[PDB]
């Protein structure tokens, strides 16, 4: 249950974790609010799909860069 | 239909009372707009006016089954002499900012 997040989400999420890597965490709910403050996300849905990749991507970085 | 002269002047007065005269295309309504009290059956405004337009003194237009006939500025001198009204330059133009 899940989809391929297109280059819109993958590019948007990778910059966020590349610019605010310290202010982010493990849990989606924390990250959802953070993303809105630091990014002008036009749509409610995609903000929760960008925040989805960010928390999935942090689970990646703690497991070998 | 044709040949009023005591009942063709009626529209002319409106045509110079205001520099425009709207109409319709339906020919069967004797409820002519703008004070048709002189028994005009909505003809003579699309029978005699096609003469007035084709001379160059008034100008025509069509918009959704309608006509928006305009009295040209240089048609005033023509439609001041047949109406033999006093020498005047005010169809509807106060010629001031309104």
């Amino acid at each position: 249950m899940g989809r391929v997040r297109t280059k819109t989400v993958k590019k948007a999420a990778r910059v966020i974790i590349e610019k605010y890597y310290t202010r982010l965490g493990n849990d989606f709910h924390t990250n959802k609010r953070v993303c809105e403050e630091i990014a002008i996300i036009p749509s409610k849905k995609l903000r929760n799909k960008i925040a989805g990749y960010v928390t999935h991507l942090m689970k990646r970085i703690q497991r070998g860069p | 239909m044709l040949m009023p002269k005591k009942n063709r002047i009626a529209i002319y007065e409106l045509l110079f009372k205001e520099g425009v005269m709207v109409a319709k295309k339906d020919v069967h309504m004797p409820k002519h707009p703008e004070l048709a009290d002189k028994n005009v059956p909505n003809l003579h405004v699309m029978k005699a006016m096609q003469s007035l337009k084709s001379r160059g003194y008034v100008k025509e237009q069509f918009a959704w089954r309608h006509f928006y006939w305009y009295l040209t500025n240089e048609g005033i001198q023509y439609l001041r002499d047949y109406l033999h009204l006093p020498p005047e330059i005010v169809p509807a133009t106060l010629r001031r900012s309104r």
Binding site: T8, V15, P42, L46 | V20, R95, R96, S97, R98
Partner: protein, 227 residues
């Protein structure tokens, strides 16, 4: 209108009058930079704005074309004399209204030059104006005795979804050439992210923005200071 007609009919009759007015208006302001009009019910009044660029026609000698066109409406739409007056305005930026380009393209076609020199000029002007994209399609008997089509493109050009409701502006005009009728379609992508002249729902669904972090500018070694 003498029993205060139902809300459904009265609101749809608002559009029809705002539909009759526009189709009539373009038949007179065609040689002018007509763009589209708006009407509002001002307190115990009525004002209709002719959004145009070639205003020198509508201004009138001491206000006569206004006097000429207000009357032709009152005699037609039943308005009482003494509360309907038309005001003119200037669309200070005209390189982004599709109708202005379309007629000016019909203007220059009938003027008597080739379509290819004429279209690129409009295509250039709509770029010298500045837009995220633009597109002109001229179809008909361009050459010979057979109908062809021709398409000019540049810039971003969205084609599907909700954003086309408020960025993309389209327009159609039939040109009367010596060999029949040809059509013009002009489309312009409007850029304004802030509130421009004609404010869109400015952001773009695909545009995800990012701002400067401004953190870890100092190591922040322990210092104590009492304000």
């Amino acid at each position: 209108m003498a029993v205060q007609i139902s809300k459904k009919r009265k609101f749809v009759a608002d559009g029809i009058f705002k539909a009759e007015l526009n189709e009539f208006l373009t038949r007179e302001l065609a040689e002018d930079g007509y763009s589209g009009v708006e009407v509002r019910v001002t307190p115990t009044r009525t004002e209709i704005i002719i959004l145009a660029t070639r205003t020198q026609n509508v201004l009138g000698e001491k206000g006569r074309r206004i006097r000429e066109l207000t009357a032709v409406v009152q005699k037609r739409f039943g308005f009482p004399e003494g509360s309907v007056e038309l005001y003119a305005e200037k669309v200070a930026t005209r390189g982004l209204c599709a109708i202005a380009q379309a007629e000016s393209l019909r203007y220059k076609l009938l003027g008597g030059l080739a379509v290819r020199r004429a279209c690129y000029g409009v295509l250039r002007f709509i770029m010298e104006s500045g837009a995220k994209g633009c597109e002109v399609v001229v179809s008909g008997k361009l050459r010979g005795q057979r109908a062809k089509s021709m398409k000019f493109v540049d810039g971003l050009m969205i084609h599907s979804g909700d954003p086309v409701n408020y960025y993309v502006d389209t327009a159609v005009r039939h040109v009367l050439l010596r060999q029949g009728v040809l059509g013009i379609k002009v489309k312009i992508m409007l850029p304004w992210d802030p509130s421009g002249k004609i404010g869109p729902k400015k952001p773009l669904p695909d545009h995800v923005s990012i701002v400067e972090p401004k953190d870890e500018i100092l190591p922040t070694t322990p210092i104590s200071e009492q304000k």
